[PDB]
Amino acid sequence: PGIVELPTLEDLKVQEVKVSSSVLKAAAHHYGAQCDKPNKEFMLCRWEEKDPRRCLE
Amino acid sequence: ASKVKQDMPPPGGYGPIDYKRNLPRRGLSGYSMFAVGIGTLLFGYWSMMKWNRERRRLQIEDFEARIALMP
């Protein structure tokens, strides 16, 4: 009953954040304070659209 | 003309020998023991109260770190 639409492998390409978990945790508070706006925009998109394919950008 | 020599008690007698039961008291009162126990309990309660409140704050900080990293 329908084809599942999937993004191409190119659309899933991104510059990865390749730091370890302890590095992320050390900077977690400052990172949450500084990059708050894009993070909250993505989280609102994610919880409103209920679809990962609609919030890749 | 040797006199008689035999196993005999010393002149006078032997020293007294104790035989009655000797079980001293050697203890505190019940009130004192209960007071020390309750005092120890109260001190422990106070210390654990402070430590657990600090632990709650530390857990909140850890959860905030996770929340900041989640997106």
mmCIF file of C-alpha atoms in Angstrom:
data_model
loop_
_atom_site.group_PDB
_atom_site.id
_atom_site.type_symbol
_atom_site.label_atom_id
_atom_site.label_comp_id
_atom_site.label_asym_id
_atom_site.label_seq_id
_atom_site.Cartn_x
_atom_site.Cartn_y
_atom_site.Cartn_z
ATOM 1 C CA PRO A 1 0.000 0.000 0.000
ATOM 2 C CA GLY A 2 2.543 2.605 -1.069
ATOM 3 C CA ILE A 3 6.268 3.244 -1.475
ATOM 4 C CA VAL A 4 8.156 4.494 1.573
ATOM 5 C CA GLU A 5 9.935 7.669 0.495
ATOM 6 C CA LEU A 6 13.524 7.885 1.723
ATOM 7 C CA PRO A 7 16.152 10.619 1.352
ATOM 8 C CA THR A 8 19.194 10.023 -0.802
ATOM 9 C CA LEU A 9 22.587 9.262 0.705
ATOM 10 C CA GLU A 10 23.715 12.747 -0.341
ATOM 11 C CA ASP A 11 20.936 14.494 1.601
ATOM 12 C CA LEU A 12 22.137 12.657 4.727
ATOM 13 C CA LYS A 13 25.714 13.941 4.373
ATOM 14 C CA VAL A 14 26.940 16.380 7.022
ATOM 15 C CA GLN A 15 30.146 17.443 8.754
ATOM 16 C CA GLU A 16 30.176 15.167 11.793
ATOM 17 C CA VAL A 17 30.926 16.233 15.360
ATOM 18 C CA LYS A 18 33.569 13.585 16.067
ATOM 19 C CA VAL A 19 34.339 14.355 19.713
ATOM 20 C CA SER A 20 33.878 11.706 22.388
ATOM 21 C CA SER A 21 31.145 11.598 25.027
ATOM 22 C CA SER A 22 33.316 12.988 27.831
ATOM 23 C CA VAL A 23 34.343 15.933 25.645
ATOM 24 C CA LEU A 24 30.661 16.608 24.955
ATOM 25 C CA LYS A 25 29.754 16.341 28.642
ATOM 26 C CA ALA A 26 32.539 18.718 29.696
ATOM 27 C CA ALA A 27 31.119 21.421 27.405
ATOM 28 C CA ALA A 28 27.461 20.457 27.844
ATOM 29 C CA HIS A 29 26.310 23.452 29.902
ATOM 30 C CA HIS A 30 28.032 26.130 27.810
ATOM 31 C CA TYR A 31 26.954 24.370 24.608
ATOM 32 C CA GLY A 32 23.349 24.296 25.798
ATOM 33 C CA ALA A 33 23.556 27.987 26.651
ATOM 34 C CA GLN A 34 25.171 29.034 23.358
ATOM 35 C CA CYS A 35 23.608 26.862 20.615
ATOM 36 C CA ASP A 36 20.129 26.961 22.144
ATOM 37 C CA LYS A 37 18.199 28.536 19.264
ATOM 38 C CA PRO A 38 18.989 26.015 16.465
ATOM 39 C CA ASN A 39 18.661 23.119 18.911
ATOM 40 C CA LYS A 40 15.208 24.234 20.042
ATOM 41 C CA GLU A 41 14.154 24.879 16.441
ATOM 42 C CA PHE A 42 15.163 21.332 15.514
ATOM 43 C CA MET A 43 13.442 19.864 18.575
ATOM 44 C CA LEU A 44 10.223 21.749 17.807
ATOM 45 C CA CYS A 45 10.353 20.539 14.199
ATOM 46 C CA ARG A 46 10.958 16.988 15.404
ATOM 47 C CA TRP A 47 8.098 16.929 17.916
ATOM 48 C CA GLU A 48 5.661 18.706 15.583
ATOM 49 C CA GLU A 49 6.310 16.854 12.311
ATOM 50 C CA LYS A 50 6.780 13.434 13.981
ATOM 51 C CA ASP A 51 8.929 12.497 10.976
ATOM 52 C CA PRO A 52 12.751 12.583 10.776
ATOM 53 C CA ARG A 53 12.578 13.096 6.998
ATOM 54 C CA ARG A 54 10.956 16.533 7.455
ATOM 55 C CA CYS A 55 13.641 17.994 9.756
ATOM 56 C CA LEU A 56 16.967 17.166 8.086
ATOM 57 C CA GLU A 57 17.955 20.788 7.425
ATOM 58 C CA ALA B 1 65.139 -39.102 119.427
ATOM 59 C CA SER B 2 63.473 -37.557 116.378
ATOM 60 C CA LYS B 3 60.177 -35.744 116.837
ATOM 61 C CA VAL B 4 57.123 -36.485 114.716
ATOM 62 C CA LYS B 5 57.029 -34.748 111.325
ATOM 63 C CA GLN B 6 53.765 -34.941 109.410
ATOM 64 C CA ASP B 7 51.834 -32.956 106.818
ATOM 65 C CA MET B 8 49.905 -30.466 108.949
ATOM 66 C CA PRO B 9 48.396 -27.007 108.497
ATOM 67 C CA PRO B 10 50.682 -24.120 109.482
ATOM 68 C CA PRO B 11 50.487 -22.876 113.080
ATOM 69 C CA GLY B 12 47.422 -20.728 113.432
ATOM 70 C CA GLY B 13 45.718 -21.694 110.196
ATOM 71 C CA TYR B 14 45.401 -21.138 106.488
ATOM 72 C CA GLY B 15 44.216 -17.855 105.030
ATOM 73 C CA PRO B 16 40.512 -17.429 104.293
ATOM 74 C CA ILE B 17 39.116 -18.987 101.116
ATOM 75 C CA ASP B 18 36.418 -17.169 99.161
ATOM 76 C CA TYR B 19 33.370 -19.144 98.071
ATOM 77 C CA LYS B 20 30.452 -16.709 97.641
ATOM 78 C CA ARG B 21 29.239 -15.687 94.196
ATOM 79 C CA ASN B 22 30.952 -12.542 92.871
ATOM 80 C CA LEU B 23 28.997 -11.084 89.933
ATOM 81 C CA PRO B 24 29.401 -7.279 89.863
ATOM 82 C CA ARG B 25 27.006 -4.877 88.184
ATOM 83 C CA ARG B 26 29.413 -3.293 85.658
ATOM 84 C CA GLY B 27 26.960 -1.372 83.530
ATOM 85 C CA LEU B 28 25.175 1.872 82.769
ATOM 86 C CA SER B 29 21.487 2.711 83.201
ATOM 87 C CA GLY B 30 18.824 2.043 80.598
ATOM 88 C CA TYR B 31 18.038 5.738 80.181
ATOM 89 C CA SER B 32 21.664 6.520 79.325
ATOM 90 C CA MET B 33 21.909 3.765 76.707
ATOM 91 C CA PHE B 34 18.638 4.812 75.084
ATOM 92 C CA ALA B 35 19.731 8.459 75.085
ATOM 93 C CA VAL B 36 23.027 7.643 73.363
ATOM 94 C CA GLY B 37 21.230 5.500 70.790
ATOM 95 C CA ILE B 38 18.689 8.185 69.917
ATOM 96 C CA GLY B 39 21.410 10.841 69.775
ATOM 97 C CA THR B 40 23.412 8.753 67.317
ATOM 98 C CA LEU B 41 20.269 8.203 65.242
ATOM 99 C CA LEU B 42 19.524 11.939 65.107
ATOM 100 C CA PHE B 43 23.083 12.823 64.087
ATOM 101 C CA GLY B 44 22.976 10.203 61.336
ATOM 102 C CA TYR B 45 19.619 11.468 60.089
ATOM 103 C CA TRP B 46 20.948 15.027 59.883
ATOM 104 C CA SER B 47 24.114 14.029 58.015
ATOM 105 C CA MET B 48 22.229 11.860 55.532
ATOM 106 C CA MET B 49 19.666 14.620 54.971
ATOM 107 C CA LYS B 50 22.373 17.073 53.913
ATOM 108 C CA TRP B 51 24.174 14.484 51.785
ATOM 109 C CA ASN B 52 21.003 13.394 49.976
ATOM 110 C CA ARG B 53 19.978 16.979 49.212
ATOM 111 C CA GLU B 54 23.419 17.571 47.703
ATOM 112 C CA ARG B 55 23.050 14.330 45.733
ATOM 113 C CA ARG B 56 19.698 15.508 44.367
ATOM 114 C CA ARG B 57 21.310 18.738 43.168
ATOM 115 C CA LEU B 58 24.157 16.813 41.511
ATOM 116 C CA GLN B 59 21.678 14.539 39.735
ATOM 117 C CA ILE B 60 19.763 17.579 38.474
ATOM 118 C CA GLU B 61 23.016 18.969 37.062
ATOM 119 C CA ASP B 62 23.781 15.667 35.308
ATOM 120 C CA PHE B 63 20.270 15.553 33.839
ATOM 121 C CA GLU B 64 20.682 19.119 32.574
ATOM 122 C CA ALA B 65 23.910 18.097 30.840
ATOM 123 C CA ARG B 66 22.036 15.250 29.150
ATOM 124 C CA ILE B 67 19.216 17.608 28.131
ATOM 125 C CA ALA B 68 21.692 20.054 26.604
ATOM 126 C CA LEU B 69 23.327 17.232 24.644
ATOM 127 C CA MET B 70 20.113 15.533 23.464
ATOM 128 C CA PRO B 71 19.280 17.475 20.229
#
